[PDB]
Amino acid sequence: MDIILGIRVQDSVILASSKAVTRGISVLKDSDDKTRQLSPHTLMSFAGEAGDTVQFAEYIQANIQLYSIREDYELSPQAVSSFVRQELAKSIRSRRPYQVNVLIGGYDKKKNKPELYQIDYLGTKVELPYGAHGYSGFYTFSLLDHHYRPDMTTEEGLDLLKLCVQELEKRMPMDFKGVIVKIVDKDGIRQVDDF
Amino acid sequence: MDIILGIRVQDSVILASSKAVTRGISVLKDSDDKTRQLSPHTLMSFAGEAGDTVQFAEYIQANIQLYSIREDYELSPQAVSSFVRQELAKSIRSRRPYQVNVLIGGYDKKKNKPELYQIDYLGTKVELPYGAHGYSGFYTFSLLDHHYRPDMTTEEGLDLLKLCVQELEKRMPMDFKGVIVKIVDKDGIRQVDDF
Amino acid sequence: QFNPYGDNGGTILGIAGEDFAVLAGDTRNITDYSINSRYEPKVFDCGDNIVMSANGFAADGDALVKRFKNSVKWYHFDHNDKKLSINSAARNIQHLLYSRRFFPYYVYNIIAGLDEDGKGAVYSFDPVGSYQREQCRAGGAAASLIMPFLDNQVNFKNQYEPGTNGKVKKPLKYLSVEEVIKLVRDSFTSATERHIQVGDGLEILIVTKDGVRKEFYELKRD
Amino acid sequence: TQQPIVTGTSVISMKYDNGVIIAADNLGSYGSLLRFNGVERLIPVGDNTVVGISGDISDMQHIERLLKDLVTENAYDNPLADAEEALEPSYIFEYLATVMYQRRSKMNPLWNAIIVAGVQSNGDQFLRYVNLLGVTYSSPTLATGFGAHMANPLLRKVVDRESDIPKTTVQVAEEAIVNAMRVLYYRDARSSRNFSLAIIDKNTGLTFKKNLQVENMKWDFAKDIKGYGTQKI
Amino acid sequence: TSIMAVTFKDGVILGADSRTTTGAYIANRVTDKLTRVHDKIWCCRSGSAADTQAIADIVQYHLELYTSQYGTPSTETAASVFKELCYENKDNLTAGIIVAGYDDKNKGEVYTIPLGGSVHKLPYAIAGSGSTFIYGYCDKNFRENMSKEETVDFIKHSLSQAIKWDGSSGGVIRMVVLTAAGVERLIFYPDEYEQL
Amino acid sequence: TSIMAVTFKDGVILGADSRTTTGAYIANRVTDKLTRVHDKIWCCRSGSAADTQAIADIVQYHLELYTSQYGTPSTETAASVFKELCYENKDNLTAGIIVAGYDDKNKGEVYTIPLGGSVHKLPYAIAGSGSTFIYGYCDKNFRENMSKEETVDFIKHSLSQAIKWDGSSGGVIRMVVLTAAGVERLIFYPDEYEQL
Amino acid sequence: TTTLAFKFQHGVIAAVDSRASAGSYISALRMNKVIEINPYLLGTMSGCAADCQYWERLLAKECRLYYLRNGERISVSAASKLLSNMMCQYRGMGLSMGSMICGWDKKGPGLYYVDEHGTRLSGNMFSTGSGNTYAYGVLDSNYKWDLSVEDALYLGKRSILAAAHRDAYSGGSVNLYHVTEDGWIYHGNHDVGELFWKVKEEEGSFNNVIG
Amino acid sequence: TTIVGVKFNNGVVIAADTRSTQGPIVADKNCAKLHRISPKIWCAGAGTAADTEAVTQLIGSNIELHSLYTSREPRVVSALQMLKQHLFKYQGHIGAYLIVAGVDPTGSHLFSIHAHGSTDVGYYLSLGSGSLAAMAVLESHWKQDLTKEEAIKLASDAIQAGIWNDLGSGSNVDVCVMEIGKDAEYLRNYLTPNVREEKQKSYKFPRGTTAVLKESIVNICDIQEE
Amino acid sequence: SDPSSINGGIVVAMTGKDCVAIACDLRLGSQSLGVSNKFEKIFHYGHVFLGITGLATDVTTLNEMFRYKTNLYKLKEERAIEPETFTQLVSSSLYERRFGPYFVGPVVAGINSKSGKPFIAGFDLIGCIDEAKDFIVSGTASDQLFGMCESLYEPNLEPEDLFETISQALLNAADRDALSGWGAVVYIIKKDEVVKRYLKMRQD
Ligand SMILES: *[C@@](C)(CO)[C@](*)(O)[C@H](Cc1ccccc1)NC(=O)[C@H](Cc1ccc(OC)cc1)NC(=O)[C@@H](C)NC(=O)C1=CC2=CCC=CC2=C1C
Ligand SMILES: [Mg+2]
Ligand SMILES: [Mg+2]
Ligand SMILES: [Mg+2]
Ligand SMILES: [Mg+2]
Ligand SMILES: [Mg+2]
């Protein structure tokens, strides 16, 4: 799929992901949710080759849910991100690699800190205040470099995110049909229904 | 460039053409007018490879304007369309062909009839009640086949055209930044400034 | 580089009547511009009142027929000498073909017989296993020459009743075996004229409740 | 997948009233080089079958051994190995055809074209072809390689259809085969003058003729041919 | 193809086979590969038949015009015209030509012109696909100032072996003798040379 | 490479040149191409040196094990082991081997095994890139039941011409004589064979 | 091909054409591109005919086994997922199969799009095949949730007609299906040749075409 | 295509089949492959059909003008030389493979010519996809000092071999005989061994079977007076 | 990509008793997309009719060219061109572009005004003439037309019978070709009257 954005503010992580799905020359769906809840305080968005994205995300989801039941304990966002990276680093040297890029947004309940991890299909992990995959960063990083502060509120984070989407909508040739926005904080995961 | 549409109603011809211009991954302009007035009652829209489109259109424009001055007489839309076709049919077997597709909308003052001609880069001419180039027809022709009548008014023609653009905006992956609409009738050529 | 496939030419034709069915095919076998045999049978009696022809690459066609004949034998062993119905045979053949989805049997297969209500039946396949029951089907080299003729003369397509002028179609009256054999002979005589891979001989297998009957007719040898 | 190295050219054959004839030259070519001049490409199996092979010689020698082993294996625990349960041409052919088609299906073919000629138990004539693709066919006349293009037309003038077989004698059939071999020597650049011929008759059995030569050749008219158009001297 | 030209006491002899192939099919089994460009200047052709025929026709034209103006041309002069064509058009040609001729002053001379368009004057020359198989035989058996009958036997034996091993060579052996006496054509059939 | 094996009255002789090339560079000018697989069964190698060495080493292993169990193997048996390797691994090999040996029963025998893995029993055999140039010479000069000295001269003269025309061949001429008397190694240097 | 399917107030409509092609040659005029997996489950076909038939009939085997083990009909969601998992095993092996799984279960009417990449999408409306763009044009401008069964059947029928007309590799006839909570209902085979002229006259559409 | 040329006592004969194809499809069942360069010089061609015609008509035109200029009857070597120099210039891109034969004041002649510009001489020749089938017959039965009647038989037998055994050849046999001191006789459809058998049924339709929308008269005449 | 099959279309011509017929479909497309159902492929220059299949730009271009040439022929010769002569003009004009050809499959049809003899002919894109007595076919459904014409045709048909035979050959051939159809036209030609009929066919 096309565009996935992420931003870590003071007390939460915000993920924005496009709604479009295209086969051939036709847009089959304009309300697709490119994300899976890995645990109550960990969300993963994804983008890459057709089919591989969902299969990979659901496979990761199943493994983390299995861990949660076995230990009766939620893994830290850092631990989950490391598990995901290893699976992708394992995948890249397989017969047929999984062509999937992800952002992992989580709230660490132990440290009381939001955390955003960017991982590409090769297994390249980086912790960031804000991140993106593909061409999305080419348009948005200049705005984020300018406006971003670490003490921003969730509402200020959403306003800066709106500005990023507006820039994408102006200068990108592709129509990605807007974005679904989700917030990850101490209370869990919720969706912003109006954006 | 991307999308150019045309429709011939009772007493006029309407041409709609996209506003987007893209180089690399960036949309450089969202207000581009993909058309040239060949004569007071003849308009030509165009779409194809970068640079070739404008060069070809302006070359045709110059030749028709030269004819008008020499004879003190406006050529019929049919005559202009035949001249254009021959230039493209001449071009396709050249060392480097001009990769340009056109629609020619004109009002014949002698016969008191609107006329729409569709010509592709090979020099393939067809007179039609409604026409398009590239992938535009794949989305729009089903609507036009259903709703089109030959006795339609100009206002009904614009409403049917709005429906076509809405369908394109829904099902096309590319963002073409809306369209500039122009009407060709007995009184000449005018632009619809609000669409 | 080694090419495992080839083209042995030939053409086949299956037509279903009301209480009978025919499966016809020319007897010519070829490679490129040479003739291998003027009489190499292509349509076979496979048992249980079923006839079959696999047209295209003869080696793959002979293997498929050989396998299906074997499938019929084992169906009797495993299911108390039960008769293999034409619809059950068709489905079985689909699975034989799809077993080689990634190294296909390069053949267009047709079978003919009678359904469980005694009516004539023709089933048609593609090289990878898609099948469907049909009334009329030509397969092979001259398939594109013959099929339109059958659409016109068997299903009365584009034919209307005089005087009405296109308002009323020609009614779909059934054909007799004698009328069908005429259409088959004329189909192959016409195909022999305009297609270089078609000729030499014509062998027709007719299926009725009474059994399987053969008819042979000569064709032009040029 | 491979490419043929040392090769053998045409093998030709036909049916006649009481049996079959088969012939093939004694050359083993190495591309354009006429490397080996004493190669036997007709291989008898018992006293009722002759297998003629063209194509790759290393694969021919392999097949030659399979057939030799087939005879050995058929004799095992078989008191009627030299009688009712002896090897038939149809058995030998179907075995080879099974092998050829299996090898092509593994994309590792035996780069050959084979003709199995013989006479069955009931006196019926057997003549069938098989090649590297596993393709099989039968006809009153059969030939491989160049023989398909040049020999078949000559042999089909003698036996054009099935009904001409009882009318064709062994003298006529042998004469036609020998003429065909001469024509191939004139026109096939990978052929030799020396060849072998085998007759399998239902009455007189297997006759295997070696060290035959193409004779009665026409070359004299060459003296009169001068230049390539305008030259007179 | 198997072609050769050999000098001897009284002049020079050209020799060749008669087989022309299109792959493995023998398009012509009685070809005449010994072609005349002047009364006593002949050439042996190898490579593309179209190219070698076109060249030899142009050379024949040049030497006919030379003769009209300047008198009988030398064998060296003929070889130079061949060379000039084969060298300047080397990108579009596939021609290997042996030139042989007789003067009263220079006697028998042999020039070979391989693919590139170089010229090499030699006592004897061999060329064609079948020449490879007789490099050793010809080197061991060639002598200078042989008699006519010795030279005929040398060419006959040599080409016999070339034909024996090369499938692209065969048919009859044609020969052309160039001396002061005149021009003699010879021919030798398979039944004669095969049993050598 | 230029290699050959020739049968004669008292047994068989193997012969070879000594040049190994990597393109136009001579990597080794004193190579020993005559290799022993058994006491009186030797082979001449052509093609990929890696492939032919690996094969001959495996064959030597098989015949050593054969001898331990069943006694002295025949030359035919040795050629069969070569064949079985060269034929079954024809897709990954580039080996042209001549096998030669002496029995008291069968006397001198020569088998050649070209690229495909076919086997051919012959009175004499030639192989290698330089063999092409001596097909005509060897055919004309070979006789059955020659003497030792005649056979040595035949091989010497033959390889001398092969070396003369083939750039991939050269150096010294090595020979191995296989008779009832035993095994004799020979060597002939350029100054001897070049002036033939 | 052109296939479509959409959810609405009274269930789900499914409509397909019946053409088959082998290059420019029309190999079949009347092919069935719908499979009746069970009385409450349908499957559309687009792409390789062999792949569509084999895998959807293998799905029906697996959906039937579900009923025997659990004593209950399989959901549309689960059926679509089994099929998408089959596609993921032969990932990149060259299969060509675009399908819609239509049905009615406990959650109400269900519609899932599944393709050879393993894609699985839930939605109210889908259209696959070489002529899907033409069908989408009619559907998008005329679709409502408040459609009557009669008007809904006509929409799917008219949408295929639009594609059959313009797309060269779509045509022959139209096969209609209506899925209810009592199961699916076949609404016949409609020849496009006859249907075109009928619709032209009654609707007034296709004015450019002469008849 | 199967095409042959055979020399005899007092002249030369050529023959050809009558099948033309577009791949595996037969376009014309009675094509005329025997072309005329001059009255007593006939050629016949295989390969690219348009090239064999165009090059035959071109050289035939120039031969006629040459004959008029020189006040002499055209020679076969002239047609040969003109053809090969033309074909050589286009380096095989003109796919014309011809057998050329004729009689002139020098005598009787028979040549073959290939697309790249090479020419051959012979007493018997064959060209086309059926050349091998025909040549097998020629090599079997040809002899020196043939008569006119023996040569026509050999020629047509050679063409028949191609008709029956080559799929690229078929239908009828055309012949042209060029004898010295005589007019050339062109024998179109000399043999007719492939006549289509009567069809089992007539497919003549009832009048009114086909549906019609509009009828109209087409004006093919010029503009009228008054 | 293949220029002979981008736009699609078919033409067929038949001889009868003192009459000829020529027919064509009306489709013009861009591969899978149908663009026009009014693209007629038959033209006439006096009493000589020419049908052209293949690349539409070349079809249009050639019509304009043969109109040009036949109009000059008439001014100089002071008479209309005949079918036999026109056939040679077409052949000549196509071969002059031997190494940059028009991607077309022309078909000539007409009756000689002097001899009264019916005439048809066909060509390849490069000029090779096919002068058949019975029928000529051209287009993307040429194989289909060959099969229909060969089985339905019989010699010496009357105009009103010939109409039915050619119409059915075209219609049923077009219905087995994706790139042909969308309407059809049939010309029935006699020595001094010509009728043109539009056929009713399926529009898919
Ligand atoms: C449109 C016609 C697109 O062309 C549809 O998608 C159609 C779908 C479909 C048809 C029948 C049954 C189920 C679904 N698809 C095709 O017709 C399909 C197109 C095609 C071709 C090649 C590929 O490979 C990438 C994909 C898609 N055509 C086929 O599958 C062809 C091979 N089928 C036949 O040629 C065929 C002949 C035949 C004879 C008898 C019975 C069945 C036969 C078939 C399927
Ligand atoms: Mg990264
Ligand atoms: Mg034939
Ligand atoms: Mg030879
Ligand atoms: Mg050296
Ligand atoms: Mg359609």
For residues C148 and H100, give the distance between their C-alpha atoms in angstroms, rounded to a whole number: 44
Contact yes or no for A89/A123 (Cβ under 8 A):
yes
Strand partners, G41: G38, G103
DSSP 8-state class, residue I4: G
Alpha-carbon distance of H142 to I129, in angstroms, equals 35
DSSP state letters, A87-119: HHHHHTTSSS---EEEEEEEEETTTTEEEEEEE
Could you tell me if F116 lies within 8 Å of chain D, comparing CB atoms?
A: yes
- Decide if H50 contacts H36 (C-beta within 8 A): no
G144-166 burial, b if ≥16 CB within 10 A, otherwise e?
eeebebeebbbbbbbbbbbbbbb
DSSP G109-151: EEEEEEETT--EEE-SEEEESTTHHHHHHHHHHH--TT--HHH
Beta pairing, strands H20-22 & H25-28: antiparallel
In order of start, what are the domains of chain G with their CATH numbers? 1-211 (3.60.20.10)
> Which run of H or of E encompasses D207?
strand D205-213
List beta partners, residue C26. Answer: C202
Select from G19, G48, G55 the residue to mutate for testing ligand 1; criterion: most ligand atoms less than 8 Å from CB: G48
Do residues D220 and D212 make contact, with C-beta atoms less than 8 angstroms apart? no
| Closest by Cβ to A23, choosing from G115, G120, G123 | G115
Contact C85, C115 (CB under 8 A): yes
CATH classification of the domain holding B30: 3.60.20.10
Q: Which residues pair with C56 in a beta bridge?
A: C107
Rounded to an integer, what distance in angstroms lies between the CA atom of residue F37 and that of residue F176? 13
Residue ID of nearest Cα to ligand 1 atom 7: G1
| Nearest ligand, CA E130 | 4
Please give the tally of structural domains in chain A.
1
Say if F169 is an interface residue toward chain E (CB within 8 Å).
Answer: no
3-state secondary structure chain C: CCCCCCCCCCEEEEEECCCCEEEEEECCEEECCEEEECCCCCEEEEECCEEEEEEECHHHHHHHHHHHHHHHHHHHHHCCCCCCCHHHHHHHHHHHHHCCCCCCCCEEEEEEEECCCCCEEEEEECCCCCEEEECEEEEECCHHHHHHHHHHHCCCCCCECCCCCCCCECCCCCCCHHHHHHHHHHHHHHHHHHECCCCCEEEEEEEECCEEEEEEEECCCC
Annotated active-site residue H2? The verdict is no
In this complex, which of C6, C35, C37 lies closest to D133 when CB atoms are compared?
C6
**D103 lies in which domain range?**
1-233
8 A C-beta contact, residue H133 and residue H2: yes
Query: Considering only CA atoms, which residue is closest to atom 28 of ligand 1?
Result: G21
CA F159 to centroid of ligand 5, rounded, Å: 10
Burial of D61 (0-12, 13-18, 19+ CB in 10 A): buried
Instruction: Write out the two tokens for D180.
Output: 């065909």
Question: What residues of G act catalytically?
Answer: 1
Query: Which atom, in ligand 1's list, is nearest to the CA of G1?
Result: 1
Residue C67 and residue C97 in contact, taking contact as beta carbons nearer than 8 Å: no
Under 8 Å between Cβ of B48 and B70:
no
Report the b/e string of G36-73 with b at 16+ CB within 10 A: ebbebbbbbbbbbbbbbbbbbeebbeebeebeeeeeeb
Give the distance (Å) from ligand 6 centre to CA of residue I181: 9
Q: How far apart are CA F57 and CA F44, in angstroms?
A: 13
Give whole-number Cα distances, H199 to A68, C136, C154, I153, in Å.
82, 21, 17, 11
Map residue I147 onto helix, strand or coil.
helix
The order of strands in the sheet holding F173-179 is F124-127, F3-7, F11-16, F173-179, F183-188
Identify the CATH class of H1-226: alpha beta
Determine the Cα–Cα distance for residues E46 and C102; give it in Å rounded to an integer: 49
Name the residue of C126, C131, C132, C136 whose CB sits within 8 Å of the most ligand 1 atoms, as the mutation to test its pocket.
Answer: C126
Query: How close is the Cα of A25 to the center of ligand 5, in Å?
Result: 67
Q: The tokens of F110 are what?
A: 């020569």
> Which of D25, D207, D50 is CA-nearest to residue D127?
D50
How many whole angstroms from its chain centre is CA B86?
17
Q: CA angle C170-C172-C175, nearest 5°?
A: 120
Nearest CA in chain H to E53: H118
Q: Which domains does chain C have, with CATH numbers?
A: 1-222 (3.60.20.10)
Strand partners, G26: G21
- Does any ligand 1 atom lie closer than 6 A to the CB of residue G27? yes
Nearest-5° Cα angle at I130, I126 to I135: 130
Concatenated DSSP letters of F56-99: HHHHHHHHHHHHHHH-SPPHHHHHHHHHHHHHHTTTS--EEEEE
Distance CA H159, CA H16 (A): 6
Where does chain H show beta strands of DSSP type E? 3-8, 11-17, 20-22, 25-28, 34-38, 41-47, 96-104, 107-113, 119-121, 124-127, 173-179, 185-191, 212-217
- Are H162 and H169 in contact by the 8 Å Cβ rule? The answer is yes
Question: Domain limits at I5?
Answer: 1-204
Query: Would you call D80 helix, strand, or coil by DSSP?
Result: coil
Q: Which domains does chain E have, with CATH numbers?
A: 1-196 (3.60.20.10)
Q: How far is the CA of G16 from the centre of ligand 6 (A)?
A: 13
DSSP letter for A173, please. S
* Neighbouring C-alpha atoms within 13 Å toward the C-beta of F147: 2
| Euclidean distance between CA atoms H20 and A50, whole angstroms | 51
Structure tokens at C150: 């059958």
- Cα distance between residue C64 and residue C59, in whole Å: 9
Closest CA to G109 of G61, G70, G152: G152
- F118, F121, F122, F128 alpha-carbon torsion, rounded to 10°: 30
**I126, I79, I121: which is closest to I100 by C-alpha?**
I126
Here the tokens at position A37 are 């809840």
Alpha carbons within 13 angstroms on the beta-carbon side of residue D208 total: 16
Ligand showing the shortest atom-to-Cα distance for residue A128: 2
Do D182 and D176 contact (CB within 8 A), yes or no? no
Q: Is G29 in the pocket of ligand 1 (CB under 6 A)?
A: no
Cα–Cα distances (Å) from G29 to C13, C110, G160, G191, in that order, read: 17, 17, 15, 10
Q: Which amino acid is at C52?
A: M
- Sequence letter at residue I191: K
Amino acid at A79: A
Closest-lying ligand 1 atom to the alpha carbon of residue G32: 12
Helix (H, G, I), strand (E, B) or coil at A14: strand
Pairing state between β D11-16 and D141-143: antiparallel
Dihedral of the CA atoms I148, I149, I150, I156 (nearest 10)?
140
Q: What is the CATH number of the domain that holds I177?
A: 3.60.20.10
Q: Which residue has the tokens 């390069």?
A: C106
Question: What DSSP assignment string belongs to F1-35?
Answer: --EEEEE-SSEEEEEE---EEETTEEEESS---EE
- Residue H162 parent element (H or E): helix H148-165
CB proximity H118 to E under 8 Å: yes
d(CA G3, CA G179): 16
Written as six digits, the tokens of F80 are 């069969």
E135 CB neighbour count, 10 Å cutoff: 21
Query: Which chain D residue shows the shortest CA-CA distance from F126?
Result: D35
Any residues with CB less than 8 A from the CB of A152 and at least 6 apart, and which?
Answer: A9, A10, A160
Q: Please give all residues whose CB falls under 5 A of ion ligand 2, grouped by chain where several chains appear.
A: A 118, 120, 124
SS3 of H32-64: the string is CCEEEEECCEEEEEEECHHHHHHHHHHHHHHHH
Helix (DSSP H) and strand (DSSP E) numbers for chain E: 5, 12
> What's the CA gap between C33 and H130, in Å, rounded?
9
Phi, psi for F160 (deg, rounded to 5): -60, -45
The structure tokens listed for C181 are 């054999």
Torsion angle of C-alpha atoms E49, E55, E60, E65, degrees rounded to 10: 160
CA–CA gap between residue C90 and residue C114 (Å, rounded): 12
**Cβ–Cβ gap B138/G204 under 8 Å:** no
**Contact present, D115 and D127 (Cβ < 8 Å):** yes
Q: Name the residue with the closest Cα to ligand 1, atom 43.
A: C126
Residues E139, D37: Cα–Cα separation, whole Å? 26
Maximum Cα–Cα distance across chain C: 63
- Residue ranges making up the domain that contains B152: 1-195
Burial class of E150 by CB neighbour count within 10 A (0 to 12, 13 to 18, 19+): middle
Inter-residue long-range contacts of I120-125, CB under 8 Å, 24+ positions, other chains counted? I120/I13, I120/I14, I120/I15, I120/I20, I120/I22, I121/I83, I121/I87, I122/H27, I122/I13, I123/I90, I123/I91, I123/I94, I124/H22, I124/H49, I124/H50, I125/I4, I125/I54, I125/I94, I125/I101
User: Of G21, G14, G19, G20, which Cα lies nearest the Cα of G35?
Assistant: G14
Q: How far is the CA of F159 from the centre of ligand 4 (A)?
A: 25
Taking the CA of G29 as reference, the closest ligand is 1
Enumerate the residues of chain E whose CB falls inside 8 A of the CB of residue H132: 25
Token match 């390789």: residue? G48
User: Is G180 a pocket residue for ligand 1 (Cβ < 6 Å)?
Assistant: no
Question: Cβ atoms within 10 A of the Cβ of H22, count?
Answer: 16
What are the backbone dihedrals phi and psi of residue H221, each rounded to the nearest 5 degrees, phi first? -70, 165
Chains touching D by CB (3 or more pairs below 8 Å): C, E, F, H
Chain D hits for C63, CB-CB cut-off 8 Å, are: 101, 134
Tell me which method was used to determine the 3D structure.
X-ray
* HSE toward the beta carbon, residue C28, CA cutoff 13 A: 35
Q: What value does the CA radius of gyration of chain D take, rounded to a whole number of Å?
A: 19
The residue whose two tokens read 């059994």 is: C211
Residue G72 tokens read as 């209950």
H25:C193 CB<8 A: no
Q: How many domains does chain I have?
A: 1
I113-144 burial code (b ≥16 CB/10 A, e <16): eeeeebbbbbbbbbbbbbbbeebbbbbbbbbb
State the DSSP code for I5: G
Beta carbons within 10 angstroms of residue I74's beta carbon? 15
What is the residue whose two structure tokens read 């002036």? F195
